[PDB]
Subunit: 450 residues, 4 copies
């Protein structure tokens, strides 16, 4: 065997089947409308159509060999897959899109390729590929815009073909509206035919209108309907363009809107230009160093038993340098990684101060912190990455003259990325295995006596 | 009896009255402006107008026979309904729209059907039908787009009629702007008249402008006002189109935006392509198997005493296979169905692990789980649908060497849809009837000894 | 005083000063550009300009006599108000807009009314009136759309005047682009002048372009700049139109989106058409009876000491029929009115059932409820409006064989609007005055014995 | 060293390098396409190009001398900065944009300035400056709109240059579509050349289309592609304009939407016009006095150890007049400034009333309050700014006949801005230093006895 739709093989086949479906959606109508296209390159159209039909057949086979999830397990029983396929509307659409209507080439002649129009009924495969690509691609907005542009181009191409067909029905050159006479040297070339039809279609759907006005009632009606199709469908698609660009700007726009609200508040309250500059510097840091997004709000949509792995694969850089995690229990790190709230501190920010509520443990992910003196400048100890502080005031200790108080003040030399671990959480998670707690308050007593 | 507006009969009548109202809103102005329309098909217009008026009268009768809610009860007293009708502005509008202005046909002649313009004053019924359909239809966006297209078409039709009337007032063919001379063979046909007027209207309201420029001051003024009506009203309607397409994409766009934020985080943090593929697979599963929507956020707008029924009608498939619910008390299932949080687990995800906080009971809705050994591969027990686990570590038990600990580790073979029932909730809800609890810890002791 | 800007007198004056400001913003540029406008109606323009200037002077006086809030109190000291006025930029703008530039009529002649262009510098007053109207009017969206239309019209009018002025500078009729020769009988009329200039302006700003193309470099540059002004500013304004219509649809669109999510869930889960019809009926009820909006989310932006008054003025209809409120303490009703959560129940919905957690007291605002038998049909007692139930299981009672249990089952005959009062809240709020509690458990014992 | 990108020097250099990048992005294509531009002002183009290249070199030097943050510290080691530069793609782009392609002037002649097209590869610097300006400027929306207008102008300019180049390739005047013959006196001027090309570009990108239709297939194709570029890219940019105006209106629109929901509720519930006027007055006050924004929601994105400084720099005006803060401990004010919830009370609003739950302490930021008698009018004490009340009922006091009760009723004479400090918070924060608490209940006893 089976294909496992989640796999890469299924996605690759989705591409390989979208190619004929897109080809069919573009060219069947073109060949049906522009007769010279069908006739001049008939030897190539036959090859391409037969290849497309072969790929359609192989796609039907793949649909027979693609497993589905019952009880969460991939069904691998062949006949079960055949039944699941045939019971779905997709099998009906596939049989309809693979009906050998090409036999009508013997009746209607080689000049009627619209018999292959049923081949469009595999559009679903194409759309599936798109909805898969949009999910799996690393450039979701580039692909989304390319998809919208493809839809625009297909719509304009189809409307060009429709215009040319209507000109044919009315008669080429019978009036100033229809496509001019084919017998003209310049206006008889297939290139000119298609490109002028596309020009007309673009002017009509984009509602520019710089085309000869209608002459007949059918022409007036078609032009009204087509200008309305233009207005509505092009507003739809080119406003989807707008929404895609909006969601492209979503993060940056939200960040900038927050900054603007802050600046409005500061200018209204006449906040000192010192503090205004400090705030602007904080936000410039958040942007430049790519910290505007908070991983919590993003990863909250992941499963906890997958977001856990995510956090591990991101923070194993530092949670191996820490003494508590991955050293004593070697598994405890998972119990708290999904609750280590990542904070960022500016240069000179006092994370801790003597005589404060010690309700948070900190793990230094990045940055240089200092166990300073209360004078403000004298740096007693420099804590680099992997260090952990703020854990002594969490625990119950014998001989602690300072209970629930910070034993020292910790300031940040530079921008520090820390993991604030709350006291309640450390309490709750160390209950399972105190084999790490013993050396934890080993460190605790050792630092509390000195 | 009375009609009970909530019923299907009332909605069917809403359709049956919207038909004449829509007919009146489309055709009265057309016949008033295009005199040949009124004259040539007068025998049909008379029949249709009289049928419309009869339906208007029957709608007034229905309004006299439609109950309203006082004290939440449907008023069935006839005279009370007559008073409620006559006291509402709707009765005034109905009498105004049913005034026999057709008598003016004897004074103004058969060429003045705008006397029936008062018939438009039942627009409310039409709009009511729409606002009912949008609520009750299964295709809300299809109907909404059809409604907007109907508004566009009606506006363009009315503007075409207005253009033709203005041409008539100025005189057909008196200058290049107005509709050409009626005496022309081609430009005198009612078909050509209406269709060219519609063409002009479309070019003006869509602001394409490929029409002969005005000549007189009245023409310049009307064209300015009409181009502005075009800009404003068509932006309104065709931007409502945009918002409707947006809300069509709302679920998919939110899902894809979450996926994009996740992928941005993973690529920025250089998350391993293993875990990136796992996350993409999780999201592909959520989409393909239609799990992107969380029933909680959707059904939270339902009444609890209706959302309860909803959850029951959805989850009675599994809550009959469970041993606790619908078996001992047979009513307890409602006390917890509105708090069974549905979770989804990937293949191989450890739902439970030995030596963890047993604070959640799980009911396997769909999927195969395994009571494995801690080695990781040896599957002791396979739990299929209807099974419940994680309930032993909830309860107070005699002789439990493992208190508040998982007696075994449960992993998911495939994608498991479970119902996580919190410990606090099971505690709170079993307090009412311990007739099920006794066999609950029957199972508890039986599994805790073996 | 003083005038007290919050008062109605200040708003009326805002209108009376917006009239000259709007007049000045519309007509000064018109008279400056269309010389015939200035000249032909000079006797009227002089009167209107002098009246506008008098009103400007009276507006300056009002600004001297309008109090401001210092320490939250309206300043009534005259000289303090004069200082507050003169210290503001508004005084500078007012003196600038009232500078007697009309004296230049003696130097530049009566054909130069753009000397009155400084009169536009009172635009602020106009805008203030708008921002006041939008706040105080009952039709905020009608006024907002009228304001946007006024901006569109003013922009188009100004661009028409600019086009005519540029034609004058280049010379009327010197090329096909500029306004045609004034000496023409038809193209020399002030009506034709202004209306064709407005036509050109509309075609340019709405970017229709059906105007003679530029000839000179200045004309090309102006047309480029004006088409870009068109694109940008008209997108701005006519997209503000879109956002205004969106916020017009905001409530209805949110309601309908909730209904659509519900219907999607129900159709996906194959919810029985019984329950689907019940849900659709619930939502039809919510809409038809105007219950889609929840007063909590709306009134949460009001002050509690004003939202309290709001809730009182709305619910004094029923909280006078209740026995506890406004009867014993006569003031207790305010302590709980801001926490009476309004619920709606469908016909037949069991609000209470025997043997359930009695943690909510209910006050029947509207609707008929029944104290039924557990059989389901036998109605023991019918509770109409003003009745209160679910209070016995809240209180501590002697001789209650049923503790924390519902003494009877309450069902809703029809759609009941109730006030669910939580047990914790009744406990917390009755602590202040048990003078009502005594008769509360009077009723309690009386019903618990029978 | 180093430059410290957060500093003002780096931003100034960002401007000084954006000037050549913008110059290059505007003029290289212009000179490449309009040959007369390159030739006539070659002496000036050479100077400007060499100055631009010198500034590019100095920008490369700056990039070598700009520190980056490792461990949150600004790297000042020269060679480390050289490595960080050369290891980034920016160094590749800078070397590519500074390659001396001007040497090709000796081969291709002075008429080929597109060899300087590589100079566009420093676009990043320009964009960086923009993203810095948008952050640091006080007019974020003005700058954003200016940036979008710059993008529009650059796109139109580039498309004008492209049109002129295509006309050159096809041949000037070979058909009606291309730019006319250069040999024409009027259509040969560089001014006319560029300005008509810009006119064509504006008509095409804004999709007005009032230009001669294409003649050749290449012209038709280019016009289709360019009209589509117009539609898509101009919708993008001029809808970004819409979103920028939306976020300009965001605060005012949210405020007005809240007011509209309130007014809809009041008119639907038939709220008395007294209370409707009171609510409208409250909202008029909120707007006029600039209180629609709540500093909590804005400043919650700031760091707590920066939002603290913000609140201090804003509220030190009053927290120096208070007796508790900045007087006894002199540091306690920071422990509670981030939890002082700012409330606003209308004139006559009873903040406190005798016999109520004293769970909030109030600090009068602005406004006159009264310790009144319960009669309602007799004002015992007038509390101005700096005063604090509601603190007696917070504390545990000996001899308090009124426990957890308000000792008096406080009403607001005028609009009072207060700081509501919750009881729990005062309890929690005074635990650290009771040196202020002693005089706190000094005041407490002193007022409780009298
Ligand atoms: N007092 C003290 N604290 C230190 C030293 N080195 C690291 N620290 C950390 O500084 C922290 C300050 O807050 P805590 O008292 O909670 O915990 C303290 C220790 O974790 C040291 O040498 N002396
Ligand atoms: N230990 C054990 N647990 C089982 C077995 N079969 C099912 N389970 C479930 O596995 C669950 C693991 O978590 P709990 O200990 O809370 O509850 C356990 C039982 O509900 C079994 O055979 N042995
Ligand atoms: N048992 C009983 N309850 C009644 C009667 N009339 C009204 N009620 C209300 O029905 C309510 C059901 O819930 P509670 O027991 O909390 O409170 C009960 C009473 O408030 C009655 O006649 N008998
Ligand atoms: N009773 C009384 N209260 C006063 C007086 N002056 C100020 N107050 C304040 O009024 C407040 C009312 O609420 P509290 O009793 O909590 O605290 C009271 C005091 O803080 C006074 O003279 N008498
Ligand atoms: Na156009
Ligand atoms: Na157009
Ligand atoms: Na046009």
């Amino acid at each position: 065997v089976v294909i496992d739709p989640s796999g890469n093989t299924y996605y690759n086949w989705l591409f390989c089947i979208t190619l004929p479906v897109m080809y069919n959606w573009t060219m069947v109508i073109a060949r049906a409308c522009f007769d010279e296209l069908q006739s001049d390159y008939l030897e190539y159209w036959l090859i391409l159509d037969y290849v497309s039909d072969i790929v359609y057949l192989i796609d039907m086979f793949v649909r027979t060999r693609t497993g589905y999830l019952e009880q969460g397990l991939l069904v691998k029983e062949e006949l079960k897959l055949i039944n699941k396929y045939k019971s779905n509307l997709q099998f009906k659409l596939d049989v309809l899109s693979l009906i050998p209507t090409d036999l009508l080439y013997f009746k209607l002649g080689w000049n009627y390729p619209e018999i292959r129009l049923n081949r469009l009924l595999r559009f679903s495969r194409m759309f599936e590929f798109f909805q898969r690509t949009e999910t799996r691609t690393n450039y979701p907005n580039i692909f989304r815009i390319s998809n919208l542009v493809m839809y625009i181009v297909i719509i304009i191409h189809w409307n060009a073909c429709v215009f040319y067909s209507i000109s044919k029905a009315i008669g080429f050159g019978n009036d100033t509206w229809v496509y001019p006479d084919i017998n003209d040297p310049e206006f008889g070339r297939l290139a000119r035919k298609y490109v002028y039809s596309l020009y007309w279609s673009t002017l009509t759907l984009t509602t520019i209108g710089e085309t000869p006005p209608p002459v007949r009632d059918s022409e007036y009606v078609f032009v009204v309907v087509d200008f309305l199709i233009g207005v509505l469908i092009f507003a739809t698609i080119v406003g989807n363009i707008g929404s895609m660009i909006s969601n492209m700007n979503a993060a940056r726009a939200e960040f900038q809107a927050r900054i603007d609200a802050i600046k409005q508040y500061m200018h209204f309250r006449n906040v000192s230009k010192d503090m205004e500059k400090r705030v602007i510097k904080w936000f410039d840091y958040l942007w430049t160093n790519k910290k505007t997004v908070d991983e919590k709000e993003v990863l909250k949509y992941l499963p906890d038993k997958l977001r856990a792995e995510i956090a591990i694969n991101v923070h194993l850089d530092t949670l191996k340098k820490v003494r508590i995690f991955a050293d004593c229990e070697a598994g405890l790190l998972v119990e708290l990684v999904l609750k280590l709230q990542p904070q960022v501190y500016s240069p000179g920010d006092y994370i801790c101060k003597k005589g404060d509520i010690g309700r948070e443990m900190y793990i230094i992910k990045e940055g240089k912190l200092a166990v300073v003196a209360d004078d403000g400048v004298t740096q007693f100890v420099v804590l680099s990455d992997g260090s952990y502080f703020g854990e002594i005031s969490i625990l119950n200790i014998k001989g602690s003259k300072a209970g629930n108080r910070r034993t020292a003040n910790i300031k940040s030399i530079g921008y520090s990325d820390l993991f604030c671990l709350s006291k309640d959480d450390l309490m709750e998670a160390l209950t399972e295995y105190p084999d790490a707690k013993t050396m934890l308050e080993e460190k605790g007593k050792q630092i509390l006596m000195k």
